[PDB]
Ligand binder design. Structure first.
Ligand SMILES: O=c1cc[nH]c(=O)[nH]1
Lengths: 251, 245, 240, 250, 242, 244
């Protein structure tokens, strides 16, 4: 391998400069197979990598794992191999009662509730997406019949205390994060996830483009975690949107 | 007046929900007169307001003065009168050597080198512009034959040390800002101005839309202060028309 | 001009080394007419400059605008022109029940609720007024038959949430300023204003003198000329 | 499942109250297979879980993925299922010139260069390991003819800038992390890894025991990254952590 | 004892509302003997307490120990027995070339390089002396024909690294304090000592007056002064109790 | 002297490389007399030093005064005189209700409510005790038939507000320390004292060994002020194990 974690060489990317970077190693193939000539490349730790072809052009699909530190490794190593563009697709808990299960969210920037973003810039630096790649995510939603939510996402180093979940062993949340969900709700913050702050801050500072789209799997104003009673029932998927965003950008 | 600083009532706005907010009280009238039926409203302290119409739609033009505290009172008090959109226009120092003087910058989000931003959100919250108004600025540039620089601006509570200016009485920059320019340069930050961090944080947190377009009057890789020698103000009026359509 | 914002030359000030720095442009002229030979200098953005003469010596009267950013520009640009002394006057409310409308506050030092002070020193540095100019401000109060409240002022980057005002569109105050009025009240903080922290920190660190007198015109918990009258006597005290 | 990520139920753990929590899902089965009756429990995302028996005592083996956020999920979710004790085994880079490739380190506490530890306690709280499980870690080294290094570990959210690696696309480290290796050096900080700060802080605060043993793969005084020239043949930190697990469950 | 550390009772103070609070226990008795009818009160840990009379008014002389935390106990427990004014006297070195050995410093406010200050107010709060006590101090200097340096003091939790000293075992200064002296020197900071930040903030926040004079016995950049400083502070006490 | 505060020369220590550092200058002679041939060295400010012999090896017994600034001077100046090991002994107030007044606490590490720590390392650095000296204090408890509480201590710059005491002149604690005792409680913090964060950070960083044992004189679940020894005999016993 040319890179220390991902198990990839530059040859294997066949000149790809754009990656779709989902969180889950298990989504990668499905993503890859919505494009042409999907090929397995590597699987090491949380990092499963496919190649596919969007309208004749090469696209790397590589999982990040949960949260910024695993993300930072993927993003650096892909960029060592010549990726300059990172499209995150993921699931997300809505914190606004008007943001329904199954809606799609385009994250334009992030509340920095991570530590990895600080390894790229002081906290004063905005965790902001690429304008042009956000534009293409928004457009790919609208083509899909979907007006996405566009705004600010709380990006958290934890799924439990940092997203003010109490259904936990101690059911205690440290002072900094006690009340914090209402703080972000009051500020019009749409959702929680766990990687966008890091991906954005490292992309913006290192001169790479990033954006993030995500399907809503629960509303935190009604359930801490989704269960069978939560609406699954499909519609227009964040995975189809990110692929068509990828085509917009390479075309 | 129905507000504590600006000398305005809501009636005076004729139903305007959108403000063009430049810095100089001496630039309000001129911007306004790019519109129709430019109307004096009020001049108090650094707050000169005009009402004008943009293809039939009422627009406040209100100066903010320099720096986020003065901006925060203009933006709060205007909102208390129905404004829900704040389009910032002005001038800037470019800190990238590919941003030429007379370039246009559209500011997506800002480094928070201010204090007023912290009176609305903790520093972890991004100082981010409204996507729709930003999209409207970008389009107005392209209608005028201008491809703007789109990215990150350093928004500083000072003109001198915070923007890493040495041509001062003491010629010292406190540690925290010593080498700060380069840091921002290396980060791909385009420019310095003194309000967008406040404007963007307070609007984002308070459910109002904001955006920022600015013309480049010095390049900081060359010199600290501009030589003593229209497009941005043309674009912001263009954008205001798009958003009120 | 010699300076980027204020539109002044070093010549225009006739060797003046002391400024009277109020916030409001529309107050400059009439502060300057309390002295001899009051002359319009420049008017740019929120910066309206006047010269006049205290017992034969020139004093510059220059407005700052609201808040430490616009203050920071005025103070730096005046200093580029040989000003070494910055007397702030103004009006304020108070957050203590014993501070009645009509009272004067001399601010000895300030809570740093601003950003621009951090552009001159880390937060550990005290936002402290010059002992000499503060003493002059006090003696002028007392000369006028006023015993001023001498204490700590909360200097806020904002009029509204930083001063824990809920009379706003959203009626929301961010967590760090939720409760913050009772905290300052309890620590004996006399009032809020929006400039003294930047002015203080910037003059201390750059080696200039500053002070801040202010008449009380409102008390949240429950004279304009006096405070201008007092600052002008302070200036003569210092230039005598 | 009764936890949201791991795919586990309590019964699946057979009363296990102790996990070995490596980073790598690829390695969970091998670690398991150093115990008895290795049993596949779940695989979801970076989270591969096995049960096995440590001299008749049930042990869960669960991968954390890299860094504190993924670790935090695993530890919360195991602890809903009755785990009260978390032994971290893994690899590390040495930042002291006397700490040789192949030595073992038992981390008694960590520099909190992470964000997830702040989701459990303010920065003033120490990221300290449990005294008992650290002692067991040291006893299981010495049982194996190994004197481990025992001290403070720099626990970093990033592999690259936060460990002051410059062999990167930009070759730039942000001002906070610039010179930071020298700083931890001078402080007698022994090594870099990416999870112990989160784990220690979430465990000490939530009332759960934790410790962490790790084998040195590179010395940062000589190479950013281990390569073929780096030393290949010694007591494994996996052998140590299984040994400690028996002692603690004895 | 009404108070757990100092071993004192309100009755023992005879209505004293003012304390001279020097750092060194061994100095207390002597400070006290500039005054009338000097009377041992208590000695526990680093806290030696005396009562003397300054122009017939009760004055407490109580040692604090070195640094903010020991200072914070003496100040709180004294205040519990009705003390409302605290005059600190000391010697100091000085970090400005224009400050000569034998000069006097009157600290008007202090850089907060302490932790105890933060146990009373966030860092934004200024570590400012009381204006009236400072004035008293300035005027007692002047009455002794001494023109004091009136400025900002760097109040450090440590004698060595927080004062950017390299003459230590390791010779190492942690990044925060690397270059820190030059920074304060540049900002006009006159000196380092180890308590004024704690004393100032706790007194400002709690509603008690404080002030600080100190003779300059050394200057990094380069008895009589100690007798001067303790003489000055006693003079200042009388000014305030008049 | 060879040092700036303590009044000690290297010669006076007789090759002692280990100090016992209690807080109270009045506790020093007493500790020293638990060893052989106890010798007054000096007394300066809050710094009273004795020498004694522990199974034939020199041990310095040096008070630190209250709180990290004074501890930092005494620790630095001892180390200038060849001291590499500092065993701290003292009193403590327990915040967990399962800790009995009269119990022993062995502080593995400290919450840094103290400023002197920051003069040695950033707050991110853990205020961790030395493994071996902590190990030694645990074994010296158990040899004495006492199972000590082992974990985390809240090491505060103040006795009053930093320990969230309200029986004060103002009866007010600043926002950062309001509700803080409950927070430390919920996190399993054992006790409050005022030196261990400075001691541990400064030893850790400077390559010296440090540990702490202390006897519980008040339970803060009951009251704020203690009502009117094993930990001192445990510390002498830990010293002999480490010098053996
Ligand atoms: O309660 C107590 C006892 C001793 N030391 C402390 O800090 N607190």
């Amino acid at each position: 391998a040319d890179v220390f974690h991902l198990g990839l060489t530059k040859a294997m990317l066949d000149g790809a400069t754009l990656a779709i970077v989902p969180g889950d190693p298990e989504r990668v193939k499905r993503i890859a197979e919505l494009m042409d000539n999907a090929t397995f490349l590597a699987s090491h730790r949380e990092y499963t990598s496919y190649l596919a072809y969007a309208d004749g052009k090469p696209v790397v699909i590589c999982s990040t794992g949960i949260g910024g530190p695993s993300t930072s490794i993927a993003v650096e190593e892909l960029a060592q191999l010549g990726v300059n563009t990172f499209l995150r697709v993921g699931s997300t808990g809505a914190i606004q009662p008007h943001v329904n299960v199954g809606d799609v969210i385009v994250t334009q920037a992030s509340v920095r509730l991570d530590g990895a973003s600080l390894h790229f810039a002081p906290m004063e630096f905005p965790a902001v997406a690429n304008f042009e790649c956000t534009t293409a995510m928004v457009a790919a939603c609208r083509d899909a019949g979907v007006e996405p939510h566009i705004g600010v996402t709380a990006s958290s180093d934890t799924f439990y205390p940092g997203q003010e979940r109490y259904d936990t062993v101690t059911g205690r949340v440290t002072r900094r994060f006690a009340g914090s969900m209402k703080e972000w709700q009051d500020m019009g913050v749409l959702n929680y996830e766990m990687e966008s702050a890091t991906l954005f801050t490292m992309c913006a500072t290192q001169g790479w483009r990033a954006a993030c789209v995500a399907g809503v799997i629960v509303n935190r104003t009604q359930q801490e975690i989704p269960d069978e009673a939560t609406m699954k029932k499909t519609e227009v998927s964040a995975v189809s949107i990110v692929v068509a965003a990828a085509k917009k950008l390479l075309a």
